Amino acid sequence: SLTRIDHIGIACHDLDATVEFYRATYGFEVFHTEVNEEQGVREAMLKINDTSDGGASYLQLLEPTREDSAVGKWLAKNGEGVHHIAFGTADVDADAADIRDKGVRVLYDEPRRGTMGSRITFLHPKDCHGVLTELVTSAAVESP
Amino acid sequence: SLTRIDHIGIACHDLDATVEFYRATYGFEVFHTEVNEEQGVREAMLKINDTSDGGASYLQLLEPTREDSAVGKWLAKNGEGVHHIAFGTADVDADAADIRDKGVRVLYDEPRRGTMGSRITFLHPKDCHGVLTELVTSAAVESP
Numbered sequence: 080s081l082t083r084i085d086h087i088g089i090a091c092h093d094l095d096a097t098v099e100f101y102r103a104t105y106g107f108e109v110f111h112t113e114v115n116e117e118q119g120v121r122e123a124m125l126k127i128n129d130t131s132d133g134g135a136s137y138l139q140l141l142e143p144t145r146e147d148s149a150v151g152k153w154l155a156k157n158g159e160g161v162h163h164i165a166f167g168t169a170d171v172d173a174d175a176a177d178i179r180d181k182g183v184r185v186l187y188d189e190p191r192r193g194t195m196g197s198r199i200t201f202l203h204p205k206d207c208h209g210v211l212t213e214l215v216t217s218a219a220v221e222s223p
Numbered sequence: 224s225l226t227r228i229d230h231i232g233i234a235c236h237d238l239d240a241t242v243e244f245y246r247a248t249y250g251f252e253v254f255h256t257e258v259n260e261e262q263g264v265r266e267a268m269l270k271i272n273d274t275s276d277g278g279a280s281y282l283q284l285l286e287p288t289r290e291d292s293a294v295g296k297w298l299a300k301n302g303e304g305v306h307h308i309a310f311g312t313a314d315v316d317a318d319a320a321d322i323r324d325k326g327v328r329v330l331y332d333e334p335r336r337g338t339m340g341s342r343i344t345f346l347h348p349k350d351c352h353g354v355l356t357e358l359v360t361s362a363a364v365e366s367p
């Protein structure tokens with residue numbers, strides 16, 4: 080089951096400048112930063128709250144590592160702004176299979192590595208009323 | 224202080240069809256529906272989780288009531304997708320004043336009525352790295 084909003088993926092041209100914007104404006108601090116070379120992003124997670132399923136909700140700020148990437152292409156076409164939304168689950172493999180069986184395009188056969196060792200997959204935005212939709216299971220198992 | 228992600232505002236051409244998409248695909252049910260004639264929207268709130276500040280996190284699905292509206296104009300230019308993000312606070316008036324004093328454009332002098340009697344304001348997307356940003360205080364006071 081999808082039991083939380085895990086994060087909002089926000090694309091930006093300059094991660095350091097956008098991180099400072101969120102710190103100066105709202106007081107949000109950096110929980111974690113990492114580079115994902117497969118996905119072509121440098122990212123910062125800003126924790127906003129904990130959630131009733133034992134997880135948490137973040138802003139995921141993303142700058143591209145290369146123009147030929149999902150985020151690099153998107154920023155070139157659309158400018159900075161919301162890129163994707165992510166739902167958390169205790170079993171992304173099972174939820175992804177159930178959604179595949181409804182005829183929504185699941186982009187990966189098997190979940191791939193995401194932030195902080197998470198396992199992630201994506202649903203095609205044209206099958207989700209225009210919203211790129213991520214499904215994620217955290218590496219550290221959650222206690223509701 | 225901004226203590227939670229309150230909701231993701233998602234624009235759609237057909238609220239009933241998009242509500243059914245989220246129910247059939249993810250099992251998300253309708254928490255509340257209302258029309259806001261000032262804002263020019265018909266909306267459905269889908270509750271995803273509770274949050275550690277005593278509040279909750281929703282998907283806010285929005286169809287326009289008229290073409291000459293924030294959401295009607297946006298859908299005409301961009302198609303269906305994420306329209307805004309909202310942060311919850313126990314005191315939107317104080318947080319909005321503190322943000323005004325940083326030179327970010329606050330669109331309302333005083334918070335206006337939003338969903339379920341909430342009080343809301345918005346920050347201009349061009350001052351927020353492309354993200355239309357809502358600040359909201361729930362009408363029913365929260366117990367962390």
Ligand SMILES: CC(C(=O)SCCNC(=O)CCNC(=O)[C@H](O)C(C)(C)COP(=O)(O)OP(=O)(O)OC[C@H]1O[C@@H](n2cnc3c(N)ncnc32)[C@H](O)[C@@H]1OP(=O)(O)O)=[N+]([O-])[O-]
Pocket residue numbers: 088115118120139141149150152153162163165186192193194197199201203204205209210211213304
């Ligand atoms: C590491 C991590 C992350 O979140 S990494 C995030 C970066 N990675 C990802 O986004 C991977 C998944 N996304 C993708 O594979 C691709 O971007 C997509 C879904 C396949 C689309 O790629 P395409 O090759 O088709 O690009 P393309 O520009 O051709 O676009 C195909 C259609 O999708 C629409 N589209 C593309 N990106 C979109 C987005 N982010 N949201 C909404 N619609 C989008 C686009 O406007 C076009 O619609 P249109 O034809 O009406 O104009 N984490 O741990 O959480």
Ligand SMILES: CC(C(=O)SCCNC(=O)CCNC(=O)[C@H](O)C(C)(C)COP(=O)(O)OP(=O)(O)OC[C@H]1O[C@@H](n2cnc3c(N)ncnc32)[C@H](O)[C@@H]1OP(=O)(O)O)=[N+]([O-])[O-]
Pocket residue numbers: 160232259262264283285293294296297306307309330336337338341343345347348349353354355357
């Ligand atoms: C009831 C409730 C709701 O959430 S009601 C949600 C609907 N209401 C609202 O969005 C009210 C606040 N928004 C607004 O007042 C206006 O839409 C905005 C902020 C002033 C923008 O209106 P404008 O009159 O300037 O429209 P305009 O298209 O001219 O756009 C001005 C600039 O803002 C950009 N923009 C407009 N809407 C945007 C959006 N949702 N996100 C990002 N950028 C946006 C737009 O692309 C343009 O950039 P560009 O010049 O680089 O192309 N609730 O309770 O939670």
Ligand SMILES: [Cl-]
Pocket residue numbers: 114115116117
């Ligand atoms: Cl890597």
Ligand SMILES: [Cl-]
Pocket residue numbers: 258259260261
């Ligand atoms: Cl009304």
Ligand SMILES: [Co+2]
Pocket residue numbers: 086088139163165213
């Ligand atoms: Co993500």
Ligand SMILES: [Co+2]
Pocket residue numbers: 230232283307309357
């Ligand atoms: Co809203």
